Nucleic acid binder design. Structure first.
Lengths: 189, 190, 185, 189
DNA sequence: TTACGTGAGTACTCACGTAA
DNA sequence: TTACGTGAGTACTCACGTAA
């Protein structure tokens, strides 16, 4: 549980207004209430601390993506749920969002970006999968090719999250989601 | 100035390389310009001002062409098309500056700078809101939702493409698939 | 304690040496302790705080000894003799710290520190002003005599510093006080 | 006049609040009106700039002191005059006073401070000389040794100078000089 | 786990060059 | 004399190291 106390505090730091700046191992140490070397007994480096946060984000998102594939069998509903999950997750975890948008990683090992790109590739592939199953489940397909649309949907989400982090979390992603979904539906249907 | 511009350029170039993902120290920048750190401060009071100048080029260059589009293109639908097609093309020809546009390169500098870029986006979205309201009130195009929701999605695709351009180390072109994207975004406002 | 006190000791030591006539950089101060520059910052947030640590010691030492003079010596003229003596003896026993009282060492540091030393002298002069009202002898003005007195002392501290610590502040104090006390009744 | 224009400028900055800190050549150039390369074709180093200021002070003061020996033949009056001359010069030159007390010399080459110690030595010798001539002139000497007395008199002056610069030029050196004198003569004579 | 600590860096400064 | 510098600092920071 100790190993989690660290990742949880690191997450709380990124959420606060301090998350906009470099989270020093000393400041992180003050949140956990332990010494600096007390952190380096669960994590070889600072980068492993982020690598663990990233894994968490991926775990939540992909798991829930799959749950939707089993729970819901209607194509449009599937896209709706995934779009909502992505924006809602970002809204409940502003600090983790700073890692998804890649701003918090600016101060860390530039290789962590590979994990971020692999996470996005999983979301995209998942999105693409849902769209492909339409002609089979409904007979109809989409105006644009599945790959293009998957990328288009993923782009709107990244853009939406970049604004969230940009505005200092003032611009909420899920606020007006219903009207937004109604817009996509009229576009995708 | 000659040497003054050599600085800004040196910066933009570094922002394009793989170093753009990490902090650009004055030591590294000085080397890239082939001068001493002191020479740097002779053209700029602080590292921040150096970035400001780049942002100044972005604000001017973008607001320049956006104004030209209004005096030239009058059709509300195509103006909206050219607006974002400009941002995507501008970012694609200025990879390094995109890191400023997405706000990643400005994490090592004064907050005040990021504000400068947030405003740049506020204005761009404000214009889109205008163009959409006119198309609705003058051409009676009954949208299935508020202009804010539409202008928000149009800006989302753009930022979505800027950030992904950065993620992939500039491998995924922001203008890629634009035409297809537009055929799905315009259908609800034609 | 162990290291925080060691640093303040190193700073005073350098302030006493020939290095005190020049800026005491952290690189150099760090070398005088046997540790790295980063090491200094674990006990002090700024170089300014290091100097405040010394200014506090100077204050605590001077003011507390002045309160002991009052409760031990009841004679007015002796009180005055003893206070001036304390100031000159303090500086003579602490060459480096005098470099601070004279204000030359603070030229390389935060302006607020010089503000502190002025505040300390006001205190000294005030307590010296109070004593002179216990009188008296020869049209005397408390406010004026107190300034002359603290002034004389201050002149002794600068002569001590600028003279590379050769002109001891307490030298000839007995003669100086002989002529003064006699004419001041 | 350019050489002098630099000296006045520097003198002026030493007289302002900036005098409390390092007077960079960059700023000295600004004040003068010319460039940094200009200031240097008139002065080899920055130390030559302060050296030329110590020279003004040295002559301003000794020439006056020698004139006193010649113009006044009463011992006490001779002492009164020199002490007044010293304090009066300081008061009229707040800037150069940051040099005499040595505070402004902390940013420059040590040599400059050894020269100041030479100046004070010439001053003290003057006093020590004026005092020795009392037995011959009046047949009476002082109740204290000429050395000790001289060192004490100059000390009062250095003290007044230190307070003047200290108080940001609020404590005037010539202030209440008359009271100090009334009590001094009373101690000697 | 805490005590005690540091190599490499980090934005910025200053008195003082030198070539045509 | 301009144009165009710079070697050596400066106070202060940080992720990660070593021994009890």
């Amino acid at each position: 549980n100790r190993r989690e106390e660290i990742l949880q505090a690191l997450a709380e730091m990124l959420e606060s207004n301090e998350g906009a700046s470099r989270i020093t191992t000393a400041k992180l140490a003050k949140q956990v209430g332990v010494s600096e070397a007390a952190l380096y007994r669960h994590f070889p480096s600072k980068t492993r601390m982020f690598e663990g946060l990233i894994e968490f984000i991926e775990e939540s998102l992909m798991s829930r993506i799959n749950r939707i594939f089993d729970e819901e069998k209607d194509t449009l509903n599937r896209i709706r749920l995934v779009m909502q999950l992505l924006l809602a997750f970002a809204e409940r975890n502003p600090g983790l969002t700073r890692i998804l948008s890649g701003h918090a990683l600016m101060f860390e090992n530039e290789r962590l970006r590979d994990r971020i790109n692999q996470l996005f590739e999983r979301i995209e592939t998942s999105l693409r999968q849902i769209l492909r199953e339409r002609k089979l489940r409904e007979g109809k397909s989409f105006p644009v090719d599945e790959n293009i649309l998957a990328a288009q949907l993923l782009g709107q989400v990244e853009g939406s999250l970049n604004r969230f982090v940009r505005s200092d979390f003032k611009y909420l992603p899920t606020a007006n989601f219903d009207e937004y979904w109604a817009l996509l539906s009229a576009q995708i249907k």
